[PDB]
Structures are given as C-alpha cells and as structure tokens.
Design a protein around this ligand. Structure first.
Ligand SMILES: CCCCCCCCO[C@@H]1O[C@H](CO)[C@@H](O)[C@H](O)[C@H]1O
Length: 663
C-alpha cells in the first residue's frame, strides 16, 4: 500500500513527526515524486523544504520512504530501477541493484576468445545494502589533549544491527570445457571457464566539499585474511547530560558535562579476503576486501599432470570460501566531522561495488617423442568487471540537531501563559503553547543565545524584540537567568525581559510595573520519559562517561586493590591502566553494593562492587582488603529491572563512582 505524493502540490509540508508516525507507526510505504515540478527553481525550493523538514535531502527524482529498525529508510532512485542522552537524527539509506546477465557476461574462452562465444558468469547477481546514518553534535569535554571534539558529526555505517542482505553472485560455481579447433602437438588444447567470484568488494566514502573531514573509521587500518571476530567501534561525544550533572534543567546553557560513547558493533569474518583501507584525503576513504587466499586461477588447480586420455575438471572449487560468491555482508563505520560553526550543506556519496572475476584454466599438451602428457595451468591476466551502485544524501549543517541542545519554549506567564513564536519573516507573536510547533522552540546555546529551532540563523535579540535577528556575537543576543526567579535578563544591558500583561508586547525593564510582568517560564518541548536508575555509587569525581550495555550483557572491569576501570566492552574501558581484566554478567543481578573508604595507598576510593544475583550467587570486583573506615552503599534493583546503561566517573587513575540506569 504505497501512499503516493506529488511534491509539486506543496508549492502552495508534513513535519518529521507526522512522517515518522505514518511510516513507522502506521507502517505505510511512502513514495515522494519530485519529477513533476516544472523548473529548477521549483525543484530546489522543494528539495530545501524537504531536507529542512526531515534533516536529510536528495537530488534524485523519486524517494521511497519505509520503516527500518524503528527509523525512516530512504530509497532514492531516478528511473524505473539514546535520545535522552544525545539529541540526534537517525535514518537509513537503502541501495538495491540487480546485476544483469549482460553485466555478468564474459567470453566462454580465454585462449580462444573469438570462437567459443560468451555466457553469463553469475545467476541473480545482486547488491542490497542498508547504510545507517546519524546526524549529531559533540561538545568539547575534558582537558585539551584527551577531550571529546567540539564538532558537528555525520556518522555512516554498515553494522550487525541494521545490515542489509549483502552482495550475491552465485549459489554454486559451475564450469564449461572447451578445446582447440585445430590439431596440436605441443600447445594448449583444452580450457575450462568457471563461474565468477568476487576478486574484491569495495566501498568508497566521499564528501562533496571540504566542510567535512574524516575524524575516524573502523577498521582503523588493514585487516588480514582468516580474521574472525566481532569488533566494536566506539565514538565518544561530549553531551550536556541530565539531572545527574545539570541541575538547571531547561535553563541550563548548552554546556558539556559528560561524554557519551556511541557504539557500532561490527562482525568480521574475512576468510579468503584481506581488507585494505585507503584514505586518499580528508574527504574520502575506501575499504577494499581483496582476495588474499586462493586469489589466482593457478591456486585452484588440484592436479598438475595427466595422460592425454584424461578429461577431468582440474579445479577444486571448494577451496573458494562462500563469501566469494554466495553471500557477502560488509561491516564498517565512518565518522565525518565539520566545525562547530559550519553552515551550508555537504553531500555524502557511498560507492559500493563488486569486482566480478570469471575463472580460466587450461591444459597444455606436451610432446616428448616417446610418450606425451598434459599439464594444467591457471590464466591470471583475464577480464574482470566492476559493477557499482552509488547513493548520496545531502546534509544541512544548520539543522537544529547540530547545536547539540534540546528545544525549549519561552512562556509569558501573565499573558495567558502564551509561547513566543516566530513566523517566516521572523516577526514575533505570542500564541497558545504547542509542542508540535517548532516555531515556538528555541535552543539555549553556549553563548546564552536563544536560537530558533525552526531557523537556527535567527536569535532573540534585545536590540529589537519585535522579531528575531541574524545571530551574531553581540551581547544584546545573550541572555542570563536570575537565580531563584522567573526573570530572564539581557547580558548587554542587565535588564529583564518583560511583557505587557494585556497586549503581550515585549520589552526590557529594570523592574515590573502594574502593566508589565517579568515572569518568563521555560520548558522542554520534547516529552522525555523518566529514567529509572540506582543512585551514584561511590564518589561523583572526575569526568563521567556514559555507555549502553552491549548485547553480551556483561560489565567489563580491570581491578586490583581498587577499581581501575569499567566499561561496556573490553575495548571501551574508562579509568586508569592498572588492575587486571575481569568480566561480570549483568543478567539476574538483584542488587549491587559498593564499598568506599580510606584507601591504604591514598585518599578515599570506591574499592569494590559486589553483585548479588537472583539465585544468591555473588561476584565482586575490586577488593575490601585495602580500605578502612569503609562505607557500603547498597542498591536493590526493582523487580524485573535490567541494567541497560552505565555512567562511569573516573580520573586518570581510578573509577571514582558509577551509576546504573534501568530498562
Ligand atoms: C593505585 C596504587 C596501588 C599501589 C599498590 C597496590 C597493590 C595492590 O595491587 C594493585 O592495585 C592497583 C589498584 O587497583 C592496580 O592498579 C594494580 O595493577 C595492582 O597490582
């Protein structure tokens, strides 16, 4: 049931929430058509409205929108072919390309190219992939040298949790035999052309301009053949944090108070292939799965000589691993960054391909005089054909999600609690509050400015309160709340934002009068469900890192006389480098008890965590043998509660405290 839409009709457009509800909640498959628009100006306008509304744009004529893993899935074409922790836009890009017989066709023979004809070397060859994309902001957190970056992020990846079907070339590898059309005494007389495999699989990532640079990727370098392992690619972003470290709520200025490690799980099983990483420059990087094991036709020979009366296929096709033609599922993670103040747009292109390689071997007839025989050989300089499928998406660096802040409103208490709202021209009015109206949403940024969420280029300016103004560095655009009151003050003049109780007109005042109120109420416009969690066990000292509990549902630790580090994976440990690695199962945990006190080797420390499970079993990390004047904080998990996130406080040497979030 595809719900067709002619974009030309909107030149008179549904919000993101509306689209997600129709596609995700109502499982409706949507098809947006841009090919009916009459001219370039009209197309550019709608394209601009489309991406401004949904956070992503395309230049393609058709866009199919479906659901995938709880997010929107965009399938563009031209012809008939965590949120509580980090604000972000997540979606997927689908790519499906059928490889035609013509595209898989090669000569039946190599030695006799123009004689034996040609045939398709693959059956139902296909490329079906799904790319996960996240648009998000990272704030600077930590000391210069070991801090998270202050940067707008575009993260693209092919991971275990959202992967598409993969690349297919053949179900099985068959062959055909051929022979010289002339007499032979000492020369090649027979040949076998085997169905094609992938000499390589390649994925190229590039950005359309220099506004974006590659920050990190996974793999970070080359990966050898016969490499089998589930890897984790973690990227640490500075975030504003919640109640555990930002006691001001909606009035808190955009500031990093913790870091968060967003992880992508990547399963590798390279077998015959080695993975070669190549970063040509700051905008482009490619990952190529190249045959390393049994890479030549010669290597496939399972016999070398025979008498002339033997006519047997001299190849052992079982030496070829199935990921070479049956099913291949790539895994990678690419993280692009742009400056904190970047503007405009950037396109990201993904080139996915398979280098199709037919296989040729021949038999050489040797003449000795008294006795003759044949020898088998492989031909390597034979034809290969790369079939590529590209896709691109456009990103606007001014999208509100890139501010890293949460939308909030400004309510005039004495004016029937109305919300300040901005129209297209930037004029201000006061209307009934409505969370579904972005025109009432603002981001309270780093400078203390109130940036319109519906147009990040405009700001609340004391210089002219009749309309928002192009954001700048002037103090007239920075606001500061007076603690203990509902009064919002202007940094430049020190006055308070007041509103006439009857007309709603805005102005700056030294104090309220009979006709004017200085009471401004602000609230988050997004509805956030309460997060249940244990108290902070231990001490709230040092930096805090947040990590989601992995699929393996285990807590990783390095400890000795105290607790050196903790993490959701052995490769994502936070804390010092001492202690010895250990692991704790989180399923069945009924209660957790932390031990803190005077540490034998200095100061106060969290020295141990004891976990008690439903069956009574207990496991402890750290020790109680090097602490005196100890104190025990015990947390009992609510019935059926499961640990899903970890908040870890640590300094350069030890974990200082931890908090466990539930469900
Ligand atoms: C941190 C200062 C430790 C001084 C001597 C400690 C002897 C106990 O053992 C030590 O405990 C440390 C803390 O967990 C670990 O980091 C060390 O690897 C471990 O050997």
């Amino acid at each position: 049931a595809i719900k067709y839409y002619n974009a030309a009709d909107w030149q008179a457009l549904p919000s993101l929430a509306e689209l997600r509800d129709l596609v995700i909640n109502q499982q409706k498959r949507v098809l947006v058509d841009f090919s009916q628009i009459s001219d370039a100006e009209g197309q550019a306008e709608m394209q601009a409205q489309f991406r401004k509304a949904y956070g992503v744009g395309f230049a393609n004529q058709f866009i199919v929108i479906t659901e995938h893993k709880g997010e929107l899935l965009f399938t563009p074409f031209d012809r008939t072919e965590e949120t509580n922790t980090l604000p972000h836009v997540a979606f997927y890009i689908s790519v499906n390309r059928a490889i035609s017989d013509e595209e898989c066709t090669f000569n039946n023979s190599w030695l006799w190219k123009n004689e034996k004809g040609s045939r398709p070397f693959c059956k139902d060859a296909n490329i079906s992939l799904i790319y996960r994309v996240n648009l998000e902001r990272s704030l600077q957190y930590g000391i210069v040298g070991s801090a998270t970056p202050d940067a707008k992020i575009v993260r693209i990846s092919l991971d275990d949790d959202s992967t598409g079907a993969g690349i297919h070339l053949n179900d099985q590898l068959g062959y055909r035999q051929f022979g010289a059309s002339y007499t032979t005494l000492d020369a090649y007389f027979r040949e076998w052309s085997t169905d094609a495999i992938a000499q390589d699989y390649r994925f190229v990532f590039n950005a359309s301009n220099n506004k974006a640079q590659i920050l990190k990727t996974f793999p970070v370098d080359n990966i050898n053949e016969k490499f089998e392992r589930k890897e984790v690619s973690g990227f640490e972003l500075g975030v504003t944090g919640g109640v555990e470290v930002s006691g001001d709520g909606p009035k808190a200025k955009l500031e990093a108070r913790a870091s968060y490690t967003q992880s992508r799980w990547l399963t590798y099983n390279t077998q015959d292939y080695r993975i070669e990483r190549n970063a040509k420059n700051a905008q482009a990087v490619s990952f190529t799965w190249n045959r390393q094991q049994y890479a030549t036709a010669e290597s496939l020979l399972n016999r070398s000589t025979d008498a002339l009366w033997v006519n047997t296929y001299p190849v052992d096709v079982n030496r070829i691993s199935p990921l070479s033609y049956a099913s291949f599922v790539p895994k990678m993670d690419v993280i692009y960054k742009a400056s904190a103040t970047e503007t405009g747009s950037t396109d990201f292109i993904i080139d996915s391909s398979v280098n199709i390689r037919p296989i040729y071997n021949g038999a050489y007839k040797h003449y000795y005089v008294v006795g003759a025989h044949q020898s088998y050989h492989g031909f390597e300089d034979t034809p290969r054909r790369r079939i590529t499928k590209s896709a691109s998406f456009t990103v606007d660096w001014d999208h509100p999600v890139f501010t890293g802040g949460r939308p909030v409103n400004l309510q005039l208490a004495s004016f029937n609690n109305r919300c300040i709202q901005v129209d297209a021209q930037g004029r201000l009015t006061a209307n009934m509050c409505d969370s579904q109206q972005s025109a009432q949403s603002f981001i309270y940024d780093q400078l203390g400015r109130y940036v319109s969420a519906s147009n990040t280029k405009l700001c609340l300016d004391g210089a002219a309160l009749d309309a928002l103004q192009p954001c700048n560095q002037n103090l007239t655009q920075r606001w500061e709340w007076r603690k203990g009151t509902d009064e919002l003050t202007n940094v430049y003049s020190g006055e308070s934002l007041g509103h006439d109780k009857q007309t709603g007109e805005l102005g700056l005042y030294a104090s309220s009068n009979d006709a004017v109120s200085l009471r401004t109420i602000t609230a988050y416009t997004d509805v956030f469900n309460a997060q249940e969690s244990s108290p902070i066990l231990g001490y709230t000292q040092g930096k805090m890192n947040q990590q989601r509990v992995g699929q393996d549902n285990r807590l990783y630790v390095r400890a000795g006389a105290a607790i050196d580090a903790l993490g959701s994976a052995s490769d994502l440990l936070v804390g010092g480098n001492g202690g010895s690695l250990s692991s704790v199962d989180l399923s069945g945990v009924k209660s957790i008890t932390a031990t803190s006190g005077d540490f034998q080797y200095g100061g106060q420390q969290l020295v141990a965590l004891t976990f008690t499970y439903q069956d009574g079993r207990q496991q402890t990390v750290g020790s109680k043998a090097y602490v005196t004047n100890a104190h025990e904080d015990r947390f009992d998990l609510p019935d059926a509660a499961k640990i899903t996130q970890l908040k870890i406080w640590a300094d350069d040497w030890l974990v200082k405290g931890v908090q466990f979030d539930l469900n």
